[PDB]
Every structure is written in structure tokens, then in C-alpha cells.
């Protein structure tokens, strides 16, 4: 391999790479702007050791005393239905509300799994609110305590706009202790000094400072039955999410997945890339027709098309190739269907007729031939009707309107096309036509599908294959040439079709 | 690869390398001369340990006491609108001013984000000043305190020229402590001694000394409720920016990016570099025409041009190549447009006519032919009009004024050029002309674009391709030769055009 | 590569290597003999630890007390205008003078940058002196103190010749302390003992001993409110500059830069080195003419020259090469101008005429031909006048005086040389001359520049190229041979010219 090839492949697939990288970067930006910020508060205490004090601070007694003091077993969560509602509310500048609950007691269903009872509180005004646990609706008022339906609740100082909802959960004490212990860290920072740094992370910058102050005070009171140097304060810059590293990771991930996909697609290509691939085997490529981005003939609708220019190049190439041929019959065929045989043949006939030579076009695709549709037709009396014997040699020839050449349609689809094409009346037709016309072009089905082309090619002076640019492979074209030679038909060469411009070439 | 090639490439691209390196060095010099200088002050104290004292010095209690003492929570910044205004003011020798503020209290909006209120003070004279916070204009006087609009301010000892502006911010205490702690360092320097080195970096050489003295005094007073050996002094040589290393890094970065760009451009070149590239394939290069830096013929305006000398070399080469040819018709063609076919053909006709031989020039570029413009014209009755049949063989031939040879213009642009060129009247014209002239030169469109050149080349005794120096590639020229041979036209050889002098060759 | 080639290259470039190495060694010797000597004084004290004492000795309190005691803040420098004046004065045996200043107080301008005020003192005699600070001239006398113009000065014991000048600077205290601390070192030398070695380097062998004694005494007095074993003494042998290592480094640096330059020049050579380089391609080198270090013909002025001997060798080689040639016309040409075509042709004609054969010399360089100047001329009626038709075949032939052969000059420079040379009168001239002379030699312009040589070579029986020894390359000669063959001219071979003797061959 070489650098030029890889750079060309990257240039060709630029749209895919850009789209994938942009999608990944957009997802990264959305996550980094919608993820909830996490603040960190710190405190510094002095040990008058410090190896067992790390375990004493994280023991369930200290944390449990803190949780009992601060009522951390009442989980209040602002209610947003979607997974991005909270982030959108924060971005729009909306101020989150809060409720001070000093007493909560749910009926404690305590089944096998749901060990955490929860209710939903809807704020109707600054004073009253509605409560629903499992569809049971109740009404409560700030101030006076509520003892109804096995539910006890005391709510103070609602701070939210009316219509807001809050999920109130009474999680078990061990769950609260585990949650507190997950986000709480103790370090020595000197490995020998009495200095201990206590760290607590959480999404509420004031609550975490209060929690760490309570932890420190409880530990201090417990020890004297240690010195608090730095009481806990919260860093106003969140520690998570780290937006810049997230976005950089997203961009690099997009680039690497795009490069992997591009390499995978490149290594899985088998189609023909250039005429030199065919010419390595020993197949003369007589032309390369580009894609015409422009039920009518292109050589007639848009005579100045680039594809028609390539076809004129093919015409002047054939005027020299088709010399010293046994007759004036040219047979266009191919390996696979929808390669361009009818396009090539019809347009070539048009470009050769505009130069003043009489041209006959025969649609010998007795199976899926649509030439009569493209030329303007009387569908009666095609090639089939002549071959089966129910027509004459003069009632099957029609004239293309915007063309300048005659044509013979397929006719009705027969049940035995390959056996009709073997009748000697076909050779009689070709011998008769080879005296009233200057050129005869025959369109045929593929050869890798059926065998009609190989029957027709016996009476053809020149035979050319059509290879589609990306679809067919060199193996298919070689197999087709060999199958034609096995049946006694000499293929003059190939015609690459549907070519497009690639920066890797 | 070899050393000579890389040295030649470096010599050829010297201008690009010099420009890029100079731009990078200029940017580095601008940064190193405009970046604000940062001074460093040091102190040395003695510990009568020293592992917890590093944490005690950087604790928020000591720094907070220092900040409360020195009022470091009032941030005063000189106002320069651009990002280089301060550096320019320092370079021009301007003395920065300062204000001693002993009391500031802003209304403390304290919204979600802007936790730091700020005002702008404009100095009108040595005594009075103007204040604007959010468009609210107020006037104040040094001395008497200001208590207006929820704003309290006491300003003493303004030292600046009138018209200067100062941004006064009241940043939060924790922000001030964090900023102080970011630029403050403590080290032991012996890992066992009681000697501690305290270091403080800042842009004001006196303020940092005062701050470090206050830090040391506060720590000393706290401990006795330690010895100060070296009170803080400031090194007058700034520690940042380090100009020499910055400039060296800039120069080396410029050199490496220039070398990378040069290597990238060299590895992405595909055009023809020397006639030997064409002669490897087996194409006889008959000449190499240099660029003529000098609507007129070069072989006439400047007969002593270097390009005309190369064309005379081509003329004497052709006088030997064109022997034993079937007729006296020469066809100049090419692979891509704007390669030099009309330049080469017209100048060659001029140089062959100055030697006393009758020369006919034909502009068979029926699509974009401008020869009549270059020769002085009566645009009627060109090649088109003759081919279509509406003109005679004698009404199309005109004479070049400063030339010495006849010519035939294209005429009106036809709708079917390639089909006009196939008429036998073209061959009749060439056969008639081959008896009244000594040489016939035909200019043609490219062959990779259209097929006109391949129609004309049937009646041409000699055919030569023109390859542009850097534009065309060996692949294009090989494809063109093969496409000409496929149509029965033997190409004698090639003509390299637009050559320039490269030190890598 | 092989050892013989590199040894030969080194022998060939011996002069360059010797010159570069001698220049580098001279610069090294000048630096090592003009750099100011730096003495080192040492002391040894005993610590009754020693880790904090290193920091206590280098603290600003001890050094500041020393500087206040010894007045190290008054910098007195002997005035020499050049950067080598002090070294020259020391080498000539001149004794430096000194002044004891016990009180200095400058006005202390104290601007942004110049924090060190300074004055210049000129010694008029043993008693009085002149002072200038910024053009303000004052006169002072030893003894009585000076208090004038904001300048206070007390000068004692001037020791210098009259007319000497001294720069007196009052540098800031911190600058003096930093300078003292830069050259002062403390070491333990045992890592555990109480022994401390104090080291001080400076250019005054007595002052540094006094300074180190003061440092030790101040530290000793401070500690007792330690034992001084070895009071400071100065090593009379300077520690810097180390002359021998400096000179060795200079010599080795010169050798390596010379070798690098030689290798770079060798790898950048492209010219022809030996006739075998041409004979590899398949070009017969018929001679190799050496440089003639000796407006006249060499074969006439100095017939026994070595170059004329090589030309006689070429003559006897040609007498065999030029057999079976179609006529007796020899054409000397070349690739690039100033290769030796006229030298070779004229001298060859002289050496062939001295053997009794009639020789005609033609100067067909119609552009820059100076043969008539070298032969003695009547500049009228040259080749140009004959070709244009305004002269006869007998009025253009002249006789060389000290030669023995006839010649034809170019004549007036024409506007169309290449088109004059194509006239059939040139062939008529050559055919007429080929019957009255035994040999005809034609001198021509280069072929890589113009095409005249290729026009003339059609009528030349033998054609030889001239390649200059170092200038031309094998590529140029191959291109020239190919361009001659493209135009139908067979080049018999080459002639290497301007050869010199190289030890690498
Ligand atoms: N170079 C081309 N540019 C534009 N359209 C093309 C080109 N080649 C084929 N086609 C069109 O795509 C369709 C498939 O080609 P077609 O020749 O009809 O199939 P088949 O090869 O099986 O006979 C057709 O409608 C044809 O007009
Ligand atoms: N060696 C050259 N030196 C100077 N100008 C040139 C040279 N070769 C081509 N040109 C000029 O650049 C333009 C493009 O060349 P041209 O021959 O006219 O295009 P084309 O090859 O398509 O016929 C022209 O204006 C031509 O005069
Ligand atoms: N081997 C040589 N020894 C001494 N002088 C030489 C030698 N070769 C050429 N020259 C002199 O150097 C100059 C350049 O050579 P010359 O033959 O005149 O140029 P050109 O090859 O273009 O005709 C001349 O003055 C010539 O006399
Ligand atoms: Mg079909
Ligand atoms: Mg053109
Ligand atoms: Mg000369």
C-alpha cells in the first residue's frame, strides 16, 4: 500500500467521515451540557496514627449519627418526566425548588423487592399540596402535620412554582449510609502527619457542606468522649462532568470509528475500479462511459452530454475495430443484467445513424426487452412472431422517431426463447438485413444468466461485452469471456460503463 | 530516496519555508514582548516536623486572615480595551496607575453565575471620578465615603493620568483564597531541616512582597498562640515569560511545520517532472518548451525568446522526423485543455514560415478555437462553413499579418462538430491543400475530452501530443496514446511544454 | 564507499581544512589568553547537623551583614573601551589600579529600568580627579568629602597612573547580595561530619579572601549569640579559564566542522570526474585536455604546453577516427557555453596546420564569436555577410598570422542566425571549400542553448562534443547527444576539457 491511496480514500469518503464525526460530537456536547453538575466540598482536620481514624470516620456509627441528625433518609427529588428535563430546566435558567421535611413516615409495604416506599407531591400553591402514593389522593397544608391512611408527613417552607412535582422516598437507613459512604473520602495527604482531608461530592453545593460539617462535628464530639482546622467549603466549579475531555474523547472516537468503517469498506470492495484491471487480464477496453446525471434516447434528448461524447469515442474506435470482420453485425452483451447493454446499444445506434449510415437495431432480449417502449412502438409483430413463423421479414421493422435508424422489437414474450433463437429463420433474417443496411446492432440478455447471447454470437461478426463500473468484477468478466469462447464466439473486447470520478484513482 | 533530492526540494521551496518560519518567529516575539511579566518573591523561615506545617501554611485560616488584613478581595485592574493594550503601554514606558481602596461594598446581585459584582471607575482628575456599574452613572470624590444606590466606596490616593479607567471587582472570599493559594508554594529544600522556603508569584513586585510578609507574620503569630530568617524580597528579574526559550520554541516549531508541509506537498505530486518519465514508457519527447514570461504571436513579437529557440529546436527535429511520412500534414493534439496546443502549433507555423516554406494552419478546434483572434480575422467563412457546404475552398483561407503563413479559422461554432469533421469534404480540403503548400499544421481539441482529434488523425501523416509540464501526468499521456492507437492513429511522440527550472532535478 | 576515496578527498581539500582549523584554534587561543582569570578562595569551619547551616550561611542576613561591613555595594571597574582592552593590559604587564571608596551616594534616578546609578571618574593626578555622571562635570580632591549636585563621594588612596578612568556604580543591596550568593558555595565533604568547606570565586585574589573571612566571622558571631579551622586563603592558580581544555575543544571543533563541510561538498558534486563516467554511458572520450595555466593561440605562443601535447594526442586520434567519413568537415560543439569549443577548435586547427595540411577554420557562432579577435582581423565580410548574400566566397577568407591556416569570421551579428544558417549558400560554401582544403573545422554555439549546431551538423562528416571537466554533468552530455541524434546528426564522441589533478582519483 502507499500513502496516496489512503489519502484518496479519505477524500472520497469525506461526507461519511464528516457526518459520523459530527453526530458523535453532537452527542458528546449534549451529554456534557445536560449531565447534572457534581460539586465537591472539602474539610481539613488535625490528628493530635491516622491509619485507624480513616476507618473510624467511615464506620456506620459516625455516618449513622450524621444521617439521623440531618434526616438524610428522606429523599426529595424534583420531578421531570424525560431524561433531559433537568438539564433543560437548568440551561433555561429555571431555579430549582425545595421542601424542608422534618418528619416522614410511609406505610412501609416492605415486600420482597420494593423496600423503599415513595409518594408524589404536587404543589398547588405556596400553602397546600396534593399527595398520591398508589392512586390514593390526599390534600395537605404546610404547617399542620398529616396523619392519614397510614401516612405521616410534616412539610415546611415549600419553595417552587405551583404545578411542580416532587418524589418523596423513605429509603432504608442502611441505603442512606451506603449512599453517603460512596461519595465520602478520607485521605492523609502526608502519610505521616495528623492532617486528614475529608472530601464529599454531591449535586447540592450547600447540602454537602452541611453534611460534611455534621460529619466533622460528630467525629470531634465522639473523640473527646482532634482539631477542626478547615471547616468544609464547596468548590463552586463542578468536578464532573469535565466538558472539554468529554468533547475531545467524543471527537476522537468519531474519527476512529469513521476510519475503521472506511478501511472496512475499502477492504471489502471487489468491483472494477479502472480499465487497467481489465487490461491486466488481456481484455481490450474500447471505451469508458460516464454516468449521465441528466423513455427517451440520451443521444437525442441531450446530444451534447458527456456520455454521448464517450459513445462517439466508442463509435470512432469501432469504425477501426470492425474492419476485416466477416459481416457488419455487432452484438452487445454483458455479464449481469442492468449493466448498460440496451443503453449502450441504442445510443450507439443513434450516434452512428446521425452520420448518414443506415442502421438496424434488433432487440434479441426476448425475455425482458423494453426497446419498443423507448422508441415508440406498435408492439405487434416483433422478433418472436417472426421466429415462430407468424410474421414476415418486412412487417417487423419500424422506425425510431427522434432517431434515424430502424429497429425490430422483441414482440410477445415466448415460452421458449432460447429454442426460438436457434431456428434458421434468425440467420435468414440477419443475412437479408446484411444487404439493406450498413450496420446491424443486436441487444442480448446477459450470458451468466442465460445462453441466448451465445446462440446469437455465432452469426455476429463483432461481439463486445459491457461491464458496469462498480457492480461487476474482473472474475465475472473473465468467466463471461471464457463462456463465450467455449461456445465458439470470439469477444473483441469490453466496454466499461457507469464510470464516476474518484480521488483515489 | 537520496540526500540530493531532499536538499533540492528544500532549495525549491525556500520561499515558503522562510515565510512560515518568519511568521512563527514574529508571533513568538510578539508574545514574548507583550506577555505580562511575573515576578517572584521569596522568604525563609525556620522550624524549631515541617511535614504538617506545609499544610498549615496553605490552610484557609492563614490565607483568609491574610486576605482580610490586606483587603485582597477588592480586585483593581487597569482598563485597556485590546488584548495587547497593557503590553504596548508597558513598552512605551507608560507608568501604570493605582488606587488605594479601603472599603468596597457592591449591591451583590448574586445570580446563578455572576457571583462577582464589578464597577468601572473613570478618573476625571486627581480628586473626583465617575462610577458606572450597569449604566448607572455616579460621581465620587476622594476622601469622603460614598453610600449611594446600594454601593459603598472609599477611594484614597488615586495615581493615574485623567481619563484612565479601572475595573473594580468584589470577588468572593473563597475565590480570593483560591487565587492566593494557586500562586503560593512551600518547600523544605532539605527534606529534614527546619528551613522552609515560601515562594509567591505575582505581577506586582511590591504587593507580592507585602502579601508574603503578611502570610509569614500571621503564621508566626498563630504558632506562638518558628523563626523568620529571611523576610520576603522580590527578584527584580521576572520568572515568566522566559523570552529566549519561547523564541527558540517558535523558530523550531516553524521549521518543523514547514518541513512537514514541504514533505506533504512533495509526496502528493503526480505531474510530469522530466522528459525521462515519459521516455521510460517509450514516448519520444521531441522538445521541451520553457515558460515565456514575456493576442499576438510570440515568434513574432519577441523572435529571440527562449521558448522560440526551443521551438526552432523542435522545427529542426521535425524536419528529420517528418521524412518518409505519407503526406505533409502534421497534427498537434494533447490530453487536457490548456496544455499548449495552439501556442505550439501557431508558433511552430511561424518559425517554419520564416524559413521560406509555404505553411497552412488549420484551426480544427470547432468548439473553443480562438486562432482567428490571434491572427487578425474576418470571422466569416471558417472551417465550419466549408464543412457544412456553405463555402468554397478559397474563401476560407486568410493570411497572418506579422506571420508569413496562411490560416483557416474555425468559423461559427456548429452544433455537431464531430459529425462535421467526418464529412469527406474535410479529406478533399486536405488533399487539395497538400499540393499548394509545403506544410499543413492542424490544431485540435484534446483527446481525453472529445474525439475530434482521432477523426482528424486518420488523414494526418504525423501526429504529436503536447504534455503540460506540471499539470498532466504520465498516466494521462499513456491513456491518450493508447486511445489514439485504438482508433488507428500512430502518435509519433510527445512535446513537453511550460517547463521551469527546478533545483531538485 | 571505500577508505581510499575518503582519504583522497581529505588530501584534496587540505587547504580548506587547515585554514578552518587554524582560524578556530586562533580564536580559542585568543579567548584563553584574553579571558579574565578567576581565582578561588577556600575556608574550613567545624560544626560542633550541617544541613540547616548551609541554608543559614547563604541566607540574606549573613550576606547582607557582610556587604554592609565591606561596602560591596560600591562597584568600581577599571575602564577599557574595547572587549579585549583588559586582557591586553594584563598581558602587557600593566598593573591595575584601585580606589578605596568609603562613602558613595548618587542621586538615585530610579526610573523603570536603570536602578543602578553610575558615574565615571577620570584620574588627573595622585590627588584630584574629575567626575561625570550625565555630562555634568565636577572636580574632586582626595581627602575632603564631596557633597555637590545631589552626589556624595569620599575617595581615599587612588592607585593608578594619571589619565585612567573608573566606572563607579551604586548597585542595589539585593543585587549585591545576589552577586555574592552566585559565586559562594558551601559543602560538607563528608555528608556527616561537622566540617564545612566554604568556597568563593572572584577576579580579585585579595578581595575574595577578605570577603570570605568576613562571611566566616559574621556567621561565627551570629552563632554564639562553630569553629574556624582554616581561615580563607586564595589559590594563586586561577580556576578559570582552563586554557588547555579550551584549546583542545577549539581544535576538535575546527576539525569536525571542516570534515562536515568537506563531506557536504563531496556529496553535492554532480560534474564529470573522470572519462570513465562518460564511457559508462557509451560515449567515446577521444582526449582529456588539462588546464593551461600559461588574444593569442596557445599552440603558437607556447607550442610545448601540456595542453598542446594533449591536443596533438587528439590530432593523431582524429586522423584515425576521421577515416571513412563522408567528407573532410569536422564540427566541434558542446553542451554549455564556455566549455572550450573555440579553444579546442582553434588550437586543433593550429596543430593540424603545422603538419603541412591546408586547414580552414569557420566561426559559425554567429551570436558570440570572437575568433577574429584572436586571429587578427578585418571584421568586414564574415560568414553573416556571405550567408545574407552581400559577399562572395573569396572575400571572407583571411589568414592567421602566427597560425598557418585560413579562417572565416562570423561577421556582423545578424538578427536571424538560425535562419541564415539554413540557407543553401552555406552548403555551397562547404562543398566549395571541401575541394581546396584538407580539413575544415567549424566552431558552433552550444546545443542546449540554441539549435545552430544541429543545422550545421547535417553537412559535417564528423561531430565531436566538448565537455568541461567539473562544470558539465553526464546528464547534460547525454541530453546533448540525444538531441543531436534526434535531428539526424551522429556524434562521434566527446572531448573532456579543463582537467586537473585530483588525489581522489
Ligand atoms: N452510463 C449510464 N448513464 C445513465 N443511465 C444509464 C447508464 N447506463 C445504463 N443506464 C440506465 O440505467 C438502466 C439500466 O441499464 P439497461 O441497459 O437498460 O439494462 P441491461 O444492461 O440489463 O440491458 C437503464 O434505465 C439505463 O437507461
Ligand atoms: N510555454 C508557454 N509560455 C507562455 N505561454 C504559454 C505557453 N504555453 C501555453 N501558453 C499560453 O497559455 C494559454 C493556454 O494555452 P493554449 O495553447 O491556448 O490552450 P490549448 O492547449 O487548450 O489549445 C494560452 O494563452 C498560451 O498563449
Ligand atoms: N584547457 C583550457 N586551458 C586553458 N584555457 C582554456 C581551456 N579551455 C578553455 N579555455 C579558455 O577559457 C575561455 C572559455 O573557453 P571558450 O572555448 O572560449 O568558450 P566556448 O566553449 O563557449 O566556445 C576561453 O578564454 C579559453 O581560452
Ligand atoms: Mg437489456
Ligand atoms: Mg486550443
Ligand atoms: Mg565559442
Q: Can you spell out the DSSP letters for C217-256? A: HHHHHHHT--EEEEEEEEEEEEEE--HHHHHHHHHHHHHH
Q: How far apart are CA C346 and CA C361, in angstroms?
A: 7
Adjacency order of strands within the sheet including B165-170: B74-78, B165-170, B118-123, B128-132, B137-141
Q: How far apart are CA B14 and CA C12, in angstroms?
A: 32
**CA angle B278–B282–B285, rounded 5-degree value:** 50
Q: How far apart are CA A100 and CA A158, in angstroms?
A: 7
Instruction: Evaluate: CB of B338 within 6 angstroms of ligand 2.
Output: yes
Instruction: Evaluate: CB of A339 within 6 angstroms of ligand 1.
Output: yes
Beta strands in C108-242 (DSSP E): 118-123, 128-132, 137-141, 146-148, 151-159, 165-170, 184-187, 195-202, 227-240
**CA angle C31–C35–C36, rounded 5-degree value:** 175
Give the list of residues 6+ apart from residue A28 with CB closer than 8 angstroms, or none.
Answer: A246, A247, A249, A250, A251
Taking the CA atoms of chain A, what radius of gyration do you get in angstroms? 42
Q: How far apart are CA A39 and CA A238, in angstroms?
A: 4
* Number of other residues whose CB lies within 10 A of the CB of residue C497: 24
Compute the Cα dihedral for C5, C7, C11, C16 and give only its sign: positive
Instruction: Evaluate: CB of B472 within 6 angstroms of ligand 2.
Output: no
Which ranges constitute the DSSP H helices of A38-101? 51-57, 60-70, 85-91
Q: How far apart are CA C381 and CA C408, in angstroms?
A: 9
Q: How far apart are CA A108 and CA A118, in angstroms?
A: 9
Taking the CA atoms of chain B, what radius of gyration do you get in angstroms? 42
φ/ψ (deg, to 5) at B92: -70, 0
Q: How far apart are CA A484 and CA A477, in angstroms?
A: 11
* Number of other residues whose CB lies within 10 A of the CB of residue C57: 21
φ/ψ (deg, to 5) at C56: -70, -35
**CA angle C238–C241–C243, rounded 5-degree value:** 105
Chain B nearest-CA residue for A493: B486
Ligand 3 centroid to Cα of residue C467, in Å, is: 11
Q: Tell me whether residues B229 and C56 touch, CB distance under 8 A.
A: yes
Task: Give me the residues paired with residue C146 across strands.
Answer: C153
Adjacency order of strands within the sheet including C359-363: C285-290, C493-499, C462-468, C329-334, C439-443, C359-363, C406-408, C397-399
For C418-438, letters b (16+ CB in 10 Å) and e give bbbbbbeebeebbeebbeebe
Closest Cα partner for B497 from B359, B372, B371, B342? Answer: B342
* Number of other residues whose CB lies within 10 A of the CB of residue C331: 28
Instruction: Evaluate: CB of B302 within 6 angstroms of ligand 2.
Output: no
CA distance readout (Å), A235 to A40, A46, B311: 6, 21, 81
Residue nearest to atom 2 of ligand 3 (CA): C291
Q: Tell me whether residues B229 and C174 touch, CB distance under 8 A.
A: no
Chain B nearest-CA residue for C453: B313
Q: Tell me whether residues C55 and B93 touch, CB distance under 8 A.
A: no
Which chains are within 8 Å of B by 3+ CB pairs?
A, C
Ligand 5 centroid to Cα of residue B435, in Å, is: 26
C-alpha B436, offset from chain centre: 57
Distance in Å from the first CA to the final CA of chain B: 13
B2 touches chain C (CB under 8 A): no
Q: Which ligand is nearest to the CA of A468?
A: 1
Q: How far apart are CA A228 and CA B60, in angstroms?
A: 12
Closest Cα partner for B297 from B442, B407, B379, B395? Answer: B407
Task: Give me the residues paired with residue B493 across strands.
Answer: B464
Closest Cα partner for B205 from B235, B176, B183? Answer: B235
CA distance readout (Å), B418 to A344, B408, B426, B447, B460: 19, 18, 12, 12, 16
Q: C241: cis peptide before it, omega within 30°?
A: yes
Q: How far apart are CA B83 and CA C252, in angstroms?
A: 50
In three-state secondary structure terms, C374 is helix
Q: How far apart are CA C496 and CA C474, in angstroms?
A: 11
Q: At what angle do helices A306-321 and B474-486 cross, to 10 degrees?
A: 50
Which ranges constitute the DSSP H helices of A234-370? 243-267, 275-281, 298-301, 306-321, 341-353
Which chains are within 8 Å of C by 3+ CB pairs?
B
Asked if A318 and B454 count as a contact pair (C-beta separation under 8 A), the reply is: no
Residues in chain A: 505
Experimental method: cryo-EM
Taking the CA atoms of chain C, what radius of gyration do you get in angstroms? 42
Mutation probe of ligand 1 site: the residue of A309, A341, A342 with most atoms within 8 A of C-beta = A342
In three-state secondary structure terms, A226 is coil
Compute the Cα dihedral for C76, C78, C82, C87 and give only its sign: negative
For C386-396, letters b (16+ CB in 10 Å) and e give bbeeebeeeeb
Ligand 4 centroid to Cα of residue A337, in Å, is: 7
Asked if A203 and A37 count as a contact pair (C-beta separation under 8 A), the reply is: yes
Asked if C209 and C48 count as a contact pair (C-beta separation under 8 A), the reply is: no
Indicate the residue of B193, B194, B316 with minimum beta-carbon distance to C455.
B316
Closest Cα partner for C333 from C184, C234, C481, C219? Answer: C481
Indicate the residue of C51, C59, C483 with minimum beta-carbon distance to B230.
C59
Q: At what angle do helices A14-34 and A243-267 cross, to 10 degrees?
A: 150
Pairing of strands B118-123, B128-132: antiparallel
Indicate the residue of B268, B415, B450 with minimum beta-carbon distance to A309.
B450
Mutation probe of ligand 1 site: the residue of A307, A334, A338 with most atoms within 8 A of C-beta = A338
CA distance readout (Å), A275 to A269, A318, A480, C285: 16, 17, 17, 48
Q: How far apart are CA B140 and CA B129, in angstroms?
A: 5
Q: How far apart are CA A82 and CA A77, in angstroms?
A: 14
- Residue B37 marked as a ligand binder: no
Give the list of residues 6+ apart from residue A498 with CB closer than 8 angstroms, or none.
Answer: A289, A290, A291, A340, A468, A469, A470, A471
Atom number in ligand 3 closest to CA C446:
22
Adjacency order of strands within the sheet including A406-408: A285-290, A493-499, A462-468, A329-334, A439-443, A359-363, A406-408, A397-399
**CA angle B205–B206–B207, rounded 5-degree value:** 100
Q: How far apart are CA C193 and CA C188, in angstroms?
A: 7
In three-state secondary structure terms, B181 is helix
Distance in Å from the first CA to the final CA of chain C: 13
- CB proximity under 8 Å: B 289-348 to C: 303, 309, 312-313, 315-317, 319-321
Give the list of residues 6+ apart from residue B19 with CB closer than 8 angstroms, or none.
Answer: none
Closest Cα partner for C371 from C408, C404, C334, C413? Answer: C408
Distance in Å from the first CA to the final CA of chain A: 13
B281 touches chain A (CB under 8 A): no
Helix (H) or strand (E) holding B232: strand B227-240
Torsion of CA A108, A112, A118, A120, to 10 degrees: -120
Mutation probe of ligand 2 site: the residue of B340, B341, B369, B443 with most atoms within 8 A of C-beta = B340
Which chains are within 8 Å of A by 3+ CB pairs?
B
Helix (H) or strand (E) holding A329: strand A329-334
B95 touches chain C (CB under 8 A): yes
Give long-range contacts, CB 8 A cutoff, 24+ apart: B419-423.
B419/A354, B419/A355, B420/B366, B420/B384, B420/B387, B420/B388, B421/B364, B421/B366, B421/B387, B421/B452, B421/B455, B421/B456, B422/A355, B422/B455, B423/B387
Burial group, residue B343, by CB count within 10 angstroms (0-12, 13-18, 19+): buried
Ligand 4 centroid to Cα of residue C31, in Å, is: 93
What residues of chain C lie within 8 A of the CB of B193, using their CB?
51-52, 55
Ligand 4 centroid to Cα of residue B486, in Å, is: 27
Asked if B97 and B163 count as a contact pair (C-beta separation under 8 A), the reply is: no
CA atoms within 13 A on the CB side of B287: 29
Compute the Cα dihedral for C280, C282, C284, C285 and give only its sign: negative
Give which of C55, C268, C489 to mutate to test B binding, by max B Cβ within 10 Å. Answer: C55
What residues of chain B lie within 8 A of the CB of A320, using their CB?
486-488
Asked if B440 and B330 count as a contact pair (C-beta separation under 8 A), the reply is: yes
Give the list of residues 6+ apart from residue C318 with CB closer than 8 angstroms, or none.
Answer: C286, C330, C348, C462
* Number of other residues whose CB lies within 10 A of the CB of residue A292: 17
In three-state secondary structure terms, B76 is strand
Chain B nearest-CA residue for A313: B451
Could you write out the DSSP letters of every residue in B399-423? Answer: E-SSSSSEEE---SPPS-HHHHTTS
- Residue B223 marked as a ligand binder: no
Q: How far apart are CA A184 and CA A196, in angstroms?
A: 13
Residues in chain B: 505
Indicate the residue of B55, B267, B419 with minimum beta-carbon distance to A355.
B419
Chains C and A contact (Cβ–Cβ under 8 Å for 3 or more pairs): no
Q: How far apart are CA A313 and CA A495, in angstroms?
A: 12
Q: How far apart are CA B178 and CA B174, in angstroms?
A: 6
- Min Cα distance B474 → chain A (Å) is 13
Asked if A417 and A306 count as a contact pair (C-beta separation under 8 A), the reply is: no
Pairing of strands B329-334, B462-468: parallel
Resolution (A): 2.6
Amino acid at each position: 500500500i502507499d500513502l496516496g491511496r489512503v489519502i484518496g480514500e479519505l477524500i472520497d469518503h469525506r461526507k461519511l467521515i464528516i457526518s459520523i464525526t459530527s453526530v458523535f460530537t453532537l452527542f458528546a456536547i449534549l451529554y456534557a451540557l445536560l449531565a447534572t453538575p457534581i460539586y465537591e466540598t472539602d474539610a481539613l482536620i488535625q490528628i493530635e496514627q491516622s491509619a485507624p481514624e480513616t476507618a473510624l470516620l467511615q464506620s456506620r456509627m459516625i455516618l449513622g449519627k450524621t444521617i439521623d441528625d440531618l434526616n438524610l433518609q428522606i429523599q426529595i427529588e424534583q420531578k421531570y418526566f424525560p431524561v433531559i428535563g433537568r438539564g433543560l430546566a437548568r440551561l433555561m435558567g429555571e431555579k430549582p425548588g425545595n421542601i424542608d421535611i422534618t418528619r416522614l413516615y410511609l406505610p412501609d409495604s416492605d415486600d420482597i423487592s420494593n423496600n423503599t416506599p415513595s409518594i408524589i407531591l404536587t404543589v398547588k400553591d405556596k400553602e397546600n399540596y396534593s399527595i398520591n402514593s398508589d392512586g390514593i389522593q390526599l390534600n395537605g397544608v404546610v404547617g399542620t402535620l398529616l396523619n392519614e391512611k397510614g401516612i405521616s408527613l410534616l412539610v415546611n417552607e415549600i419553595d417552587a412554582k405551583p404545578g411542580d412535582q416532587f418524589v418523596i422516598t423513605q429509603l432504608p437507613r442502611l441505603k442512606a449510609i451506603s449512599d453517603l459512604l460512596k461519595s465520602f473520602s478520607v485521605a492523609d495527604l502526608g502519610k505521616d502527619t495528623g492532617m486528614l482531608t475529608l472530601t464529599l461530592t454531591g449535586d447540592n453545593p450547600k447540602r454537602i457542606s452541611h453534611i460534611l460539617d455534621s460529619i466533622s462535628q460528630n467525629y470531634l464530639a465522639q473523640n473527646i468522649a482532634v482539631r477542626i482546622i478547615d471547616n468544609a467549603v464547596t468548590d463552586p466549579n463542578p468536578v464532573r462532568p469535565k466538558k472539554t475531555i468529554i468533547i475531545v474523547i467524543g471527537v476522537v472516537l468519531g474519527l476512529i470509528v469513521s476510519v475503521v468503517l472506511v478501511l472496512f469498506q475499502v477492504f471489502l470492495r471487489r468491483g472494477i475500479e479502472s480499465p487497467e484491471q481489465l487490461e491486466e487480464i488481456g481484455i481490450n477496453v474500447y471505451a469508458s462511459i460516464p454516468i449521465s446525471e441528466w423513455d427517451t434516447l440520451l443521444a437525442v434528448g441531450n446530444p451534447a452530454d458527456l456520455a454521448v461524447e464517450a459513445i462517439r469515442g466508442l463509435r470512432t474506435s469501432l469504425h477501426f475495430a470492425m474492419m476485416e470482420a466477416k459481416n457488419n453485425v455487432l452484438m452487445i452483451s454483458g455479464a449481469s443484467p442492468s449493466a448498460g447493454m440496451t443503453f449502450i446499444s441504442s445510443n450507439l445506434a443513434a450516434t452512428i445513424a446521425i452520420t448518414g449510415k443506415k442502421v438496424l437495431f434488433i432487440d434479441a432480449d426476448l425475455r425482458k426487452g423494453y426497446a419498443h417502449k423507448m422508441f415508440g412502438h406498435k408492439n405487434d409483430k416483433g422478433l418472436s412472431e417472426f421466429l415462430s413463423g407468424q410474421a414476415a421479414a418486412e412487417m417487423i421493422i419500424d422506425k425510431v422517431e427522434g432517431g434515424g435508424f430502424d429497429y425490430i422489437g422483441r414482440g410477445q414474450i415466448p415460452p421458449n426463447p432460447a429454442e426460438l433463437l436457434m431456428h434458421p429463420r434468425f440467420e435468414q433474417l440477419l443475412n437479408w438485413a446484411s444487404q439493406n443496411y450498413d450496420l446491424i446492432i443486436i441487444d442480448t440478455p446477459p450470458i451468466l444468466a442465460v445462453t441466448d447471447a451465445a446462440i446469437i454470437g455465432r452469426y455476429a461478426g463483432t461481439c463486445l461485452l459491457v461491464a458496469r463500473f462498480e457492480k461487476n468484477t474482473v472474475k465475472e468478466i473473465d468467466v463471461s469471456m471464457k463462456r463465450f469462447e467455449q461456445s465458439g464466439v470470439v469477444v473483441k473486447g469490453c466496454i466499461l460503463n457507469g464510470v464516476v470520478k474518484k480521488a483515489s484513482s
